[PDB]
Design a binder for this molecule. Structure first.
Ligand SMILES: Nc1ncnc2c1ncn2[C@@H]1O[C@H](COP(=O)(O)OP(=O)(O)NP(=O)(O)O)[C@@H](O)[C@H]1O
Ligand SMILES: Nc1ncnc2c1ncn2[C@@H]1O[C@H](COP(=O)(O)OP(=O)(O)NP(=O)(O)O)[C@@H](O)[C@H]1O
Ligand SMILES: Nc1ncnc2c1ncn2[C@@H]1O[C@H](COP(=O)(O)OP(=O)(O)NP(=O)(O)O)[C@@H](O)[C@H]1O
Ligand SMILES: Nc1ncnc2c1ncn2[C@@H]1O[C@H](COP(=O)(O)OP(=O)(O)NP(=O)(O)O)[C@@H](O)[C@H]1O
Ligand SMILES: OC[C@H]1O[C@@H](O)[C@H](O)[C@@H](O)[C@@H]1O
Ligand SMILES: OC[C@H]1O[C@@H](O)[C@H](O)[C@@H](O)[C@@H]1O
Ligand SMILES: OC[C@H]1O[C@@H](O)[C@H](O)[C@@H](O)[C@@H]1O
Ligand SMILES: OC[C@H]1O[C@@H](O)[C@H](O)[C@@H](O)[C@@H]1O
Ligand code: NA
Ligand code: NA
Ligand code: NA
Ligand code: NA
Ligand SMILES: [Zn+2]
Ligand SMILES: [Zn+2]
Ligand SMILES: [Zn+2]
Ligand SMILES: [Zn+2]
Lengths: 312, 312, 312, 312
């Protein structure tokens, strides 16, 4: 039958009814509230909104945090105020439907494996670029959550010793260098330094550096705004180097890049792919994985979460 | 029946006859020669020496390099002169027994999973500390080699951007910071700076910095030589931080540390474990893997390689 | 005659009447307000308070920012809201006395050269550890401010490429790794990870991590609190490595460490000195500078600023 | 009258007779031999060759190492086998003329200050890019050697913690990232990865990566060889970032870039200057130094050394 998927990210909540073939039948979006209690309210509003007109059997939540092996509790989140949050229990008692809670990028990996760019592969690795950087692991045709449920937390691999402060409480985490937030940071740095090379970018906002938004950077880069193009170059430096490290770790047939910015397709995927190829160890002597945009784009997580609910 | 395992590392070749329960029935050791042709000669000598007195059915090779998915060819090695080396074919035609070629640390992981510290677990990660740093992945009770056979090359994950030159041709690789060679480097740095704190260490060699060998550092640290103890501290800084990154990646129930220096047990494992716990993301909010010495120590690879031959 | 020195730091304003031999005759302290206009008010209050009972001829300001070659304007400050601030003009029109504006750590260097640990030397380098990290250069018995007045901004030398965000707008600046603020950061990190090793430290505050203050860390370290001792070790790692770089740059006869934490003397100077000696290039082949506490401690800047006013 | 200058670098020895206006009247070049005794022989050959036809009064040596405050002894050299080498005494007894020994880049700074790009300035900083990276400091119209003679060893400032091994015995030194040797390294890395983008570069040598020489990279970049252009970009990343750090340290009116590659002028200076401006702290709020090629190019050191002999 039909289930609902709800993707709860640091910035946005998105929900939809999803059928057995991963077709999205409805859309609901709302901003992620700042408190755990407000988030439960918003989840309920999202489920109610997306469910309009449809007979719904279960709810799958893709949550932006460390989710336990029982798929019920958000143990820890760097960019949302969740600490040992019993999300399954709270949502079940309010919506009156069975709920499964999965990590958001685990869910995106699953969505792409079933219905997107991972179809036909056995071993694929997903990264999502958004508020943070999430990971998802498909090995031997199965999602791998690890012993304690918290595998694929790629965003907190240390890429710069003693580097940037992260929401997780550590320093130098990959997500501080490769994420939608990092992209925005790169563009604001560059627009502040050389505003004369950011005219198009600034014109898409309110004209100020502070008014630069992720989607502006994408549109401006399409139009050839040098500062926007350079910001994507910097994002790709770190995203591609990290994908090369993931090739050393997992050696998959494909990497699948999701998150909101993956909606931009080759605009972001081409520099990431080129960077991956520059960083891949062993030069000419070893094979290279494909580097692919999430076919479902930013919706992969809600689709995968919906489908993971259906297999409950 | 009985098979032979041969572990070919950057420094040493070790072979032995191994029974069905992973008992080692014979030992042969020789230094790794500098050329690929000399290595084939040494493999043949090792097989002949270890095989004395025993009826042997197959040969498993654990090779210190990137091994292909067909388990026959060393694609690339950073510390041995192998480039697309058809090791299976060359050894088969000379010994007249079936041969399987596996990566050495893949083989160590398998040996520990079957006969050592990984028994009873479903998801474990092995690192070996030796000439280089090797990895091995057991997920869902199975060795995972990846799409192209070259998963678990943990030694070439970039831990320091623009860092130390590595034999793989890249910079900043984990193995330049955590390996037996790195340990020796740390001790020589420290003994050169403060020889008065290295009296015991230098006394175990020829009295010179250049004469410091890995095994001297271990023995000296047991005796409380401050420079040797400090060198183990530095090795553990990098080994433990990397294990914390592997927890972010794989979230296994256990890490198993092998390689020659794992022969030292808690001398090296205790600082590595303590370091792992200091670096593990998420503080009190998430569970910690065990950090264990390879029960087979430096012999895990030959045992695992022997057993992988038997399942051919 | 007598002049007033006023040291305006990121956290504190301190003023005093200073005689010709650098004796401090009065003390006034107030917290640094958050706005430039509030700071001018506070400077006036500090001058009035310190001046009680004394015939005062001039005012010297040691300001925590980039000061111009005319010694009148704060061009830029990372931790105070000053941008092209005409501090000399604003204070002169309100106090009715001649004013000279110097960088705070330039003033501290001068105070120590004239009246403190730099006496008898010709070439000394000062660093101050406080809200930020400041520098001061004495070469050939003269304070060196550079062509544009902004020499000795040692706090913004990049020590970690792509490292921690700094108030100056760049990343990886020395002051993010060595300063009083960094010390507090190190202690809060360590007390959060292992509170059982921070009992004494937490007991000196309100019992919480958030309640840890710099002075608590110092007192706790004196009492042997392991977390406090470890925090000083981490501060010294970065402070000493940077002093070794300054030896490569300037090769002075002495380094003088000032700022509020220098009030602690050998508690902080001993680990910094030991670290300096570990990092100094060239081992046994080259001589080492002295590493000394500011004899005037945190008051060096106000003394030096007072004296720089007198030579106007 | 006339003196001889001799510049002894890691790769090359160059000598010439120099008049009072810094005009070079003769040229002699020979490769730097591998032993200290062979170097003294080569110095004597260089002095004899350059002196042909000329009445010579003194010899100034610009030596690529840490030179003492007495200007007589090479205390330490990272790229030449000198340890406490009494160069003045050895050369004086063999040539029978007075000798002064200065650091090579100190001598280059002096040559440029007197006869080149530093004319008219009071405070300038020189870096030389060659076998290593050297520095020279002019402050208040005077060369500054520091208390122990070893100021301006900019090549061994640590730019990457735990970075590349340096000849000085430390890691992460600036000279491993910015020097002629680093340039060659960058080009060989890039030509090995993408030889199809290095056709012109490889054609100027023997066609192999191993045959790439510094001068080939320069010529190829002029012709628009993408790999050569990219190598200069990478050199400039590190050289410019370091110059921005030197602006924080010294705030001079000008930086002067010397060494053999400075012979190329704007080919290398333009990317270095642009990089400097990108990295300079404080954006629009503070003034920028000039970044200039050594007017004497690679000959600055021999000219400056000759002139420093004349002021003995
Ligand atoms: N199409 C886009 N182009 C550029 N940046 C984007 C795009 N979509 C989202 N972002 C940025 O990515 C971050 C939000 O990530 P997203 O995946 O959309 O939301 P989430 O709440 O993390 N789940 C913000 O920093 C956005 O500015
Ligand atoms: N027990 C030990 N203690 C300290 N270092 C060791 C020990 N065994 C080996 N080493 C060091 O580890 C490296 C060799 O690794 P090992 O795993 O013994 O050989 P391999 O050829 O890499 N397979 C050398 O640098 C040794 O000095
Ligand atoms: N005696 C001390 N021990 C430890 N930390 C200190 C001490 N004095 C100041 N600090 C810390 O240093 C920073 C303030 O520096 P200080 O030099 O006192 O003030 P300023 O306003 O920067 N001039 C704060 O982070 C304090 O917590
Ligand atoms: N014109 C040039 N272009 C590019 N690289 C150069 C040039 N001249 C020298 N080099 C490189 O710089 C290094 C030698 O430096 P140089 O200053 O010429 O000699 P020295 O012996 O260090 N004094 C070598 O790595 C050369 O390949
Ligand atoms: O939302 C993307 C990712 O953000 C990271 O900060 C969280 O640790 C992950 O659990 C999540 O998958
Ligand atoms: O021998 C340990 C490891 O050394 C590394 O340098 C090689 O890349 C690996 O394949 C090997 O497992
Ligand atoms: O207050 C100490 C130092 O703090 C730094 O952040 C400022 O840039 C310096 O100008 C000041 O000397
Ligand atoms: O030759 C350039 C520079 O090379 C460096 O390696 C040496 O330490 C310096 O003394 C010298 O000036
Ligand atoms: Na995940
Ligand atoms: Na492996
Ligand atoms: Na200063
Ligand atoms: Na010099
Ligand atoms: Zn993190
Ligand atoms: Zn490597
Ligand atoms: Zn800064
Ligand atoms: Zn060095």
């Amino acid at each position: 039958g039909l289930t609902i998927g709800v993707d709860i990210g640091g910035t946005k909540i998105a929900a939809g009814v999803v059928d057995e073939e991963g077709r999205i039948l409805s859309t609901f979006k709302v901003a992620t509230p700042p408190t755990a209690e407000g988030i439960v309210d918003a989840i309920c509003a999202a489920v109610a909104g997306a469910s309009e007109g449809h007979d719904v059997e279960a709810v799958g939540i893709g949550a932006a945090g460390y989710v336990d092996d029982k798929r019920a509790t958000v143990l820890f989140a760097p960019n949302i105020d969740w600490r040992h949050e019993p999300l399954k229990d709270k949502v079940e008692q309010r919506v009156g439907l069975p709920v499964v809670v999965e990590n958001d990028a685990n869910a995106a990996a699953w969505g792409e494996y079933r219905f997107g760019a991972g179809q036909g592969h056995d071993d694929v690795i997903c990264i999502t670029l958004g508020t943070g950087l999430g990971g998802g692991i498909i090995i031997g045709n199965k999602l791998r959550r690890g012993r304690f449920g918290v595998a694929a937390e790629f965003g907190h691999i240390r890429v710069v010793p003693d580097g940037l402060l992260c929401g997780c409480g550590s320093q130098g985490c990959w997500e501080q260098y490769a994420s939608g937030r990092a992209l925005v940071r790169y563009a604001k740095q560059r627009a502040n330094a050389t505003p004369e090379n950011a005219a198009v970018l600034l014109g898409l906002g309110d004209g100020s550096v502070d008014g630069i938004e992720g989607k502006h950077i994408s549109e401006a880069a399409r139009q050839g705004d040098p500062v926007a193009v350079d910001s994507f170059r910097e994002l790709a430096r770190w995203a591609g180097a990290g994908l090369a490290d993931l090739a050393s770790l997992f050696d998959p047939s494909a990497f699948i890049v999701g998150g909101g910015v993956s909606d931009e397709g080759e605009l972001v995927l081409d520099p990431i792919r080129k960077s991956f190829r520059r960083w891949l160890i062993g030069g000419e002597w070893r094979p290279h994985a494909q580097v692919l945009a999430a076919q479902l784009g930013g919706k992969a997580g809600l689709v995968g979460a919906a489908d993971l609910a259906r297999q409950g």
